Each structure stands twice: as C-alpha cells, then as structure tokens.
Amino acid sequence: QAGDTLNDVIQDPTRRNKLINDNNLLKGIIMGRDGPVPSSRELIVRPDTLRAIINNRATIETTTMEAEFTETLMESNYNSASVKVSAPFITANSEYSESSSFKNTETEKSMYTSSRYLFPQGRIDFTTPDSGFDDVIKLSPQFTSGVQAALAKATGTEKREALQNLFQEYGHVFRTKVHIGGVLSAHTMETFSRSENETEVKQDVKAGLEGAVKGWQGTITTSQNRKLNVKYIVNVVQSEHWRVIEVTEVTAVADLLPQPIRGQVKDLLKPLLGKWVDVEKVPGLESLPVSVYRPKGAIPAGWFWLGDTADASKALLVKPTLPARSGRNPALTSLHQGSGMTEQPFVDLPQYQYLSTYFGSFAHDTPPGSTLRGLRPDHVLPGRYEMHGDTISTAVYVTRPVDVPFPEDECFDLKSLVRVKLPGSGNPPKPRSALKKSMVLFDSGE
Amino acid sequence: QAGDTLNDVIQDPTRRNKLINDNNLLKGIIMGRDGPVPSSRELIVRPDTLRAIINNRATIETTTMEAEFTETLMESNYNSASVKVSAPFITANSEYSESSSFKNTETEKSMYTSSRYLFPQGRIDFTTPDSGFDDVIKLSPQFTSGVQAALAKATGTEKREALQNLFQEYGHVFRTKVHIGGVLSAHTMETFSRSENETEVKQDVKAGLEGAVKGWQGTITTSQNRKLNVKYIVNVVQSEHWRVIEVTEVTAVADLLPQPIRGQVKDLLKPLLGKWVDVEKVPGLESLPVSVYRPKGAIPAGWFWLGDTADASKALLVKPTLPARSGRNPALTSLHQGSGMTEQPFVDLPQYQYLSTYFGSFAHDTPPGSTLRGLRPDHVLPGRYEMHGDTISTAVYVTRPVDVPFPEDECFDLKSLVRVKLPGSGNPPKPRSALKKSMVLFDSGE
Amino acid sequence: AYAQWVIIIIHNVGSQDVKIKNLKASWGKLHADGDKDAEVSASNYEGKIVKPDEKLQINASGRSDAAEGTTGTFDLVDPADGDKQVRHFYWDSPWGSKTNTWTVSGSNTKWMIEYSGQNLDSGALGTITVDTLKK
Amino acid sequence: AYAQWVIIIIHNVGSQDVKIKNLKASWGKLHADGDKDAEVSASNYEGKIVKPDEKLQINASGRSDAAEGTTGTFDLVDPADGDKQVRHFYWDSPWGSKTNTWTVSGSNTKWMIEYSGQNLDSGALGTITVDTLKK
Amino acid sequence: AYAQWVIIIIHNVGSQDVKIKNLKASWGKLHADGDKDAEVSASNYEGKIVKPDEKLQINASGRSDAAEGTTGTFDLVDPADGDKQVRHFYWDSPWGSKTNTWTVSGSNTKWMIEYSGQNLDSGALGTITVDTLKK
C-alpha cells in the first residue's frame, strides 16, 4: 500500500468507487442557509473511470475574498472562480440580519482570509457538456425526469416552485475539479479603514494566519497588533482517509442541461418580472437642479416600483415571481416610515436596499408609497455617482451603472436620484446601488 | 532495492510506467489562473523507453527572476529558459489586480528568489520534432483530431474559440527535460531601490534564503536587516517516492505540431488583427516642438487605435480576435476620464497600459476618445525615450523600441508621444511601453 | 470675558471622513457646551474624525472677566488623502475691537465647504455652522 | 509702498478658453513684469483670453514708497457660454495691516479652480498661481 | 522680521528621484506652511527624497520683530548617481538692503532646473517654484 497514488486508487474498481462515495463526487452542493453542504441524491451517473493527476507538494497557501456572504465558501476552500460562481446562490439563500460583523461602507472595508496547510495527492476532473469532449458527464435519469416534470406544470408559478424544490434537493452547483488529500485550514475576517494600505493589511493578516496554521489558540495577534479570531478545520488523518481539500472549479447545475431546456430553466429562475411604463414629473421641487420623475398613473395590481429617477422617458416596474413563503428570502421588501425627524423610508428586512431617496413624504399606507419596495442584497451591485447642483442644500446624485466588459454583470441604467443632503437627522444610509439586468425577465406572457 | 537508480526504474517496465504516471510525464502544463498545473489528458503517446542520466549530487542552488508574473513558475522550479518560454501564457491567463506586491517602476525594482535543496537521482529527456532525431515524441491521435476539428470550423472566431478550449484542456507547454528526486524549496520576493547595489541585494537575499533552506520560520532577517517572507515547499519523503524536482526545458505545445498546421495555429492564436491607416495633424498644439498625429477620418466599426503618435506617415489600428468572455482577460481595455484636475485617461482594468498621453480633452463617450484602448500587460515591452523641446513646459518624449537581435522580441515603432510635464495634478503614470510585433496579425482576410 | 464667545458646528454632510487638526486657541479658552466654566483641552478634539452625518461642536469664549476676547485656528484635512489639507479656519472675537473675524482659507478642490451664521458687526461672533462634503 | 505687491498667474491647465474681465485696482497700480516703475493700464489685460496651456501674469504693487498697499479685483469668465462668471477674485495687500486678503468667490460647477502660493500672515501677498480647468 | 519671507516649491517634474542636502538657514528661521510662528528644524527636510510628481515646500522668514532678514542655502543632488550635485541654491531676502537675491549655481548637465516667481526689487523675496527634471 505504501507508495500508492490516486492512479492506483482509480485503477482498482473497489477503491475508486470507495473514493467516489466517500467524497460525494456524484452529488451537487446545495448552497443553502447552512452553507455548501453536499446533497444526498446522486446528480450524475457513476463514471467507469476518473481523470486524475498526481501532485504531492505540501505547502501553505493563502486566499482572500471581498464578497460579503462567502464565509462558508472560504471555509470550504473554494478558489476565487468557484466563489464567484457560487456567490449568487449563497447570498440568495443566506440568513440576513443586522449587527453583521461584515462592514462594506464607503469608509471601511471588510475581508475574509483563509490559510490552508495542504498535503495533496492529486486532482480529479469532470467533463462538462459545454466542453464538447466525448467523455461528458451524463445527468441521472431521475434528475432529468424531475426537470421535465417541473417544466410540464400548468402555470409558471407552479413551474418555478417545482424548479425551486428540485434545486433545493439536488443542489445548485457541481464540483468539476477537486483536489484530494489532507488539509488543515485556518480562517478569519478583518475590517479596516479604506485609507489604510490594503497591501500591508493583507500581508500582515496573511503572515499571522500562516504562522497560526504552521503551529497547528483561538485568537492571534499580528505584527500590527491586530487581533484576529481564527476558526480551525481539520481534514487530515492510507488512501482510505483521503478527502476533498479544495474546489478549483464549479459549474451551475442548470448549465449541465441541454440547451433548449437550459434556456427555459434559466429564464424561469429569474426572481423578478420587469416592465417599462410611462413617467410623470413630480410637482414642486423646482429648487433642485434636475427634474424628478415617478411612474405615471396607477401602478398595475401586483406590481411595484423601485424609486424616483431622473430619466424622463420610462420607469421600471417589477413583480415577484415566487410567492412569499416561510424560510425563503422575498425578492422585495416593504418600507416603513422613519422613527423621527425624517420623511425617508427604511427597509423592513435587515439587509435589503432601495435605489432612490424619496422626494416627498413617505406613507406606506397610501400610493405611490404603498408600492415602493426594496431589493434583496443579491439583486444589486454598487454604482457610481454623477453630481448635479451648485450648493449642498440642493445637490443630487444620479446613479449610473459601472461599465463592465462582461454582460453578466451589467446593471440597469435607471438614473436613480439621491439627495446629497437630506434635511433633518437620523436619515437612512444613502443608497448607491443599481439593479442587476440578469435578475429581471422581460416580454414574458406571465 | 538499495542502490537502485533511474536506470533500474526505466529498465523495469512496471516501475517505468509507474514513474511516468506518478510524474505526469505524458501531460502538458496548463499555465492558467492557478499556476502551472498539469493537465489530466495525455498529450503524447506512451514511450516504450526513456532517455535518462544518473546524478546524485545533493546541493543547494539559488535562482532569481525579474519578470512580474513568474511567481508560480519560480515556485515550480522552472529555470530561466523555461520561465522565459512560459511567461507569455502565465501573464495572459493571470489574474491582474491593483495593490500587487510587485513593483517595477523606474525608481524601484522587484525580484523573486528561490532556493532549492536538491537530492537528485537523474534527468529524463524527450525528443522534440524540431530536433530531427528518430525517437521523436508522437502527439496523441486525440489531440491531433482535436486540432483538426478546431481548424475545420466555419469562421475564424469559431476556430480561435476551439483552439483556446483545446489548449486550456491539453496544456500550453510540454516539459522536455525534467529532473527526478527530492527537493525542499524556499521562495521569497524582495523590492529595493534601483540605486542600491543589485549585486549586494542579491547576495544578501541568497545568503538568507540558503541559510533558511538548510535548517528545515515563515520570516527571515538577512545580514542587511532585510525582512523576507518565505514560502516553503516539501517534495521529499525508495524509487516509488521520486518526483519531478526541476524543469530544465519546456516547448510550446503548438511547436509540436507539423509545420503546415503549426503556422496556422500560431497565426490564429494572435490576439489582435492589425491595420495601417492614414493620419492627420491634430489642430492646435503649435507650442510643442513636434507635430501630433491621430488616425484620419472615422475609425472602422469594431476597430480601435492606441494613442497619438509623432509619425507623419501612418497609424496602427487593432481589433480583438476573441469575444469578451467571463474569466478571460480582454486584449484591450476601455479608458475613463480622470478623477480630477486632469484631462488624461485612466485604464479601466487593473494592470493594463496605453502607449501615448492624450493631447487634448479625453471624453470616452465621443470619438476619437471612444475608440482609444489600452493593452494587456503581455502585449507590451519597455521602450526608450527620445527627448524633444527646450523647456520642461513644452518638452515631449517619442517612444522608440529597444533594438534586440532576436526578432521574437521586436516591437512596433509607433513613435508614441508622451508629454514631459502634464499640467494639473493627479495625472496617470507616464507610459513608456511599445507594442509587441508578435501580438498582431496582418493581411488577414478577417 | 464671557460676552465674547463663538460656537463652531462642523457638519460632515458628505460620505467620507474629515479630520480636525492643529486646533489651537490663542486667546480665551475652549469649554464644554452650555458651561463656559467647564474648560476643556484642545486634545479633546485634535485628530478627531468626523464620520459622515456626524456633527462636532467647538465652543470657545473669553476667560473669567479678563479683558481678553477669543481667537483660534484649526484645519480640516482629508484622512483618506494622506491628511491633505482641506481648509484652514481662523476665528477672532476681540474684546477691544468691535469688528469680529471669521476667515476660511485653502484651495482643496475636491471638497465643498459652506459656513454660515457668523456675526461681524459687534458683540459675540456667534454660532457658525460649517457643512463639509467631498465630491 | 513697493513692499506691498502681488503677482497673479492665471494658468489654463484645461482645453477651453477663459477670459479676464473687470480687472480694476482700487489702490495701487498695475505694472510690468519685474519692473514696478513701468505702470500699465488695466486695458492691457481686460478682455484678454488666456489660451489653453499658457500663462498670463498680472503684477500689482503699491505706489512708490507710499503709505498705500494694493487692492484689486477681476472676474474669470467662460466665453463659451456667453461670458458667464467662473470665479471672482479679490486681492488686498495693505500697507497699514498684517492680514492680507485673497478671496475667490462665485460658483460655476463646470469649472475647477485651484490656487496656491499666497501668504496671508504678514508682508507682501506673494506670487499666487491659479490653475483653471473646464470639466 | 516677518515682512521678509520666502517660499520654495521644489517640483520634481521628472521621473527619477532628487534629494535635498545641506539645507541651512543662516538668518531667520524655517517654519511650517501658513504659520511663521511654528518654527521647524532643517533636519525636517535634510536628506529628503522628492519622488517624481511630488512637491516639497520650504518656508523661511525672519524671526519675531528682529531687524534681521532671511538667508539660506541648499543643494539638489542625484541619489541615483552617488549623490552627485545637481544644483546649489542660495536665497537672501535682507531687511536692510532693498534688493533681494536668488541664485542657482552648478553645472550638472543631465538635469534641467527652471525657477520662476522671484521678486528682486523690494519687499519679500516671494514664492519661487523650481521645476526639476532628469533627462
């Protein structure tokens, strides 16, 4: 047995099957409220062999992440690409709450750090259908039949509910490249002012955490006298004890389906249905440098708007696709009047955000206030401000999307209006967010 | 077993095959975002024997590198020639970001150092087709068929996409000479002012790192009181545990193909399509010692220019060959107006560079500003300045290529213009780069 | 003398921090709001960060019955730009001369500062609200 | 006296024309470069356009050995929009006081103006360089 | 005396470092910008490196009411060429003599130095901007 490698394990059918079963290589990851836990239902068909490479270099690696809800992924040792792919699901299914230790304000920045002391044995890879090679993985007939049954339902709401249940059961992503071996992991989070040198905070934290993982103390003091709380994970103990130590690539489970069904599933999974409507100029507010526009007429029943905009052409209405249910984050939230000395609204739910400040008096019991809603944190991305006006008392910001080369991250250009100086005191934090284009479905007959 | 050498291992068919499999000698290296990881697909056909030499001299060797994105190669123990061959791919596929600990400004210089305590057993060599000997390595029929299918596609864009996928799957380079045995490696990076004696900084760092690898502490103090962070890698544990400890030579996978197909693949892998167009004199700017020229007329749709030039004959337009996709570095980047007190543009993406300063007011929303682009860091090489003008307020630099004897490193002589003193404050760093000739494809019917 | 007094309300209407520096009362004394007797030290405000939407009060006045007025200086600086100077404020409410003085100098262009409420004819300098914002 | 003097350099660091208007020295006299004896009328500068990327110098000084400083004003105005105001500059280097005055009032969000080199403590008002840029 | 003063703005317009050396105020005192009272030591600038695109301010002026003027010297040197002398600067704003003096000497040929803004007739020496570049 001594000197045995992943090659020998794969060559022996019994040992190969034991490795597959013990590492859950045929199952997707559910990315739920408890984190990336593998499902208990097989997603793909058992392969007759595995693609593997041998690697035995033991060393300490360190990774850093800036996303908010990626703590569990970092604890599971997902590289940057895998964390980026999995972030939407983790955010959507997370448990939001105030008093979150993570801070991402315009003045301070928070980051997660993870150090892995690895004893690798190799890497196992799977062929996705998009690759185009002859050894693609084949989805299980049970999963395919479940998808067909979900898409064969009478109504769009029923189809979406069936798809949600199916994905909650079978997982949201599939690990396509996984490293085998043992690993001792140490994870921490650090918040620091944006003015501080980021390439020195990162270096100090990395040095401290690397020293901590080499020795193996729940608390660490770095060179800069920074106090860090460290969480330790042990995944080391013979080929029978080899376990997955790192995920180098994941592919969304939806992407594994044939194209005609994949398109329908992706469209049906969009949280919001969108619509374009005419706009009307808000009476008054002649002091402000730019005009304020709100949706004209009565909002159609069941639809909501997102806030005041400087665009004089059209306004975007959105409608939830999934009915509100316990244990599921709503796509939108109601807003409530502020506590005192402010007419601005506040998000009912912990970590939701609206795009524009209210230009007037907000009353949630009467229109158009009763139809104003916030957004789930995964629906929005940070934008940029364009300033108008000559004085603080009347200045406004128009929120424009941050141009990106990849269409996947494009955001709607709603030109949300933000008052520079809100009269009174105790106002809500200024919104600087833009809606994601991928979260809205247009032209549907729904 | 005691006293056994690579000769015995190669003589025994079972042990030879075990060595080949455990060391991945038939597979290329993918040179990707995670570093030089071997592929899981066999590139060459299994040889019936191996060429090997025996060497058992254990000693500590040290190497230094000045290239920016070669950290992972140095960690993988690639000598200077292999690092030089592999640098283009690593740079192209790297993850760029600001706050990079590497510094290569005109005032300071950064370098990587690596010390390997080696216990070698020998060296294994492969015959490339270019050598001309009778025992050349034979590319696998699967790889050959993949290349043929990629080149048989209808459109150039599809051909390039297929080639990109094929090379991402099968690797970018192939290790032709590899040392076997065990190795303890210690790696670090050091930044120092260019004024300091380089042959004393190098000696001090080498002494410190060599002392560190002998006794084997994440941090080291050298004789000059330099503080170094050291990363340790263990590759030592019987012929069953021998592993690759150093790569002495690598050959690009494209170079292994027969010449008629190799030419087409090399041409198709060029990121940019080039074109020569007429030029027009910029109005105004009569104070400057030399005339400024910009592309005349409207830029053809889909094409972009690189900046103002002092050449009065022609201007170079470039066009990307691969569509923008997530996880892939674009060949070109858009530019955005500066934050304040400057009309100069800034690169949208972290580590890209443009060749000329803008002589005027840059507005990315209108031409010719909307067609100005930067370059990926692997597209450019440092140039030299030729000064014109008698006073600082009006002086300019004309960027000329650094003459080299090898055509592989030739750069376009675009005569990029750089204003010596940019009015205002908070200007972008002065560009001193020239475009590589090998990165542009001319006269194509595309 | 207490009849000569000044209050300065720094209000960071912007979204990025602004730091106080070089606060120095050449004449008179600083004190806590509502109690000219409760003298306070300049260190109580030196180097303080005014977070966005926060208000910071500086109360100065003449000493106990002395013929002195009050006079002082300070600087608003940007902590996020290497403490680059935003503005320099000089205040003077003399006991002898009737005319007061409130001067704001500096040339930082990525900041907007608006001060209002001062009195310059006679009597105390008054209350001055200084709204600060970073573009 | 000549000890009271000021140099105002207008430096266009942008790419749009800026005009000087309403230049007027209530006290003192405009004069030539490096020559406080060669008086020059305000007409030499009024109505002039400081082209992008070149500097225009205004030299003011008090009467020779007189008990008089130099006080004056000028508007920098954008001609691209019908000669609207960019900013209004007032300078005062008095002979019978220590506090010089250099005020840049007015509002125009389309223009960015920085200035440096002034001295307001005591003595002459110095060489103030004013960088103007239209954005 | 404070009426005699000078400001020196070293602006490294080039792309390579330039070092201050041998800074020495024979008369008067150095001080921090905007406060002639806040005296500063020559060590605060001795041996300082002006990185490219950086600006360094040296403020000198007479002492408190003394009949002395101000006078000083320093050297710009090249850190990358064994501290080879680039230039030697001498400044003198006397209290008795009306004429001032600003002299730049040296023969380093791979450097370009351009100084502007001095006043030599009467009064304070003023503000001098010294743009430095290495060919």
Curated annotation (Swiss-Prot), chains C, D, E:
This is Ostreolysin A6. It comes from Pleurotus ostreatus (Oyster mushroom). Coiled coil: none annotated. Monomer. It comes from the Eukaryota. Keywords: Cytolysis, Hemolysis. One of its GO terms (biological process) is symbiont-mediated hemolysis of host erythrocyte. Has hemolytic activity against bovine erythrocytes at nanomolar concentrations in vitro. Promotes active pleurotolysin B (PlyB)-dependent permeabilization of membranes rich in cholesterol and sphingomyelin. May play an important role in the initial phase of fungal fruiting. InterPro entries: Aegerolysin-typ. Belongs to the aegerolysin family.
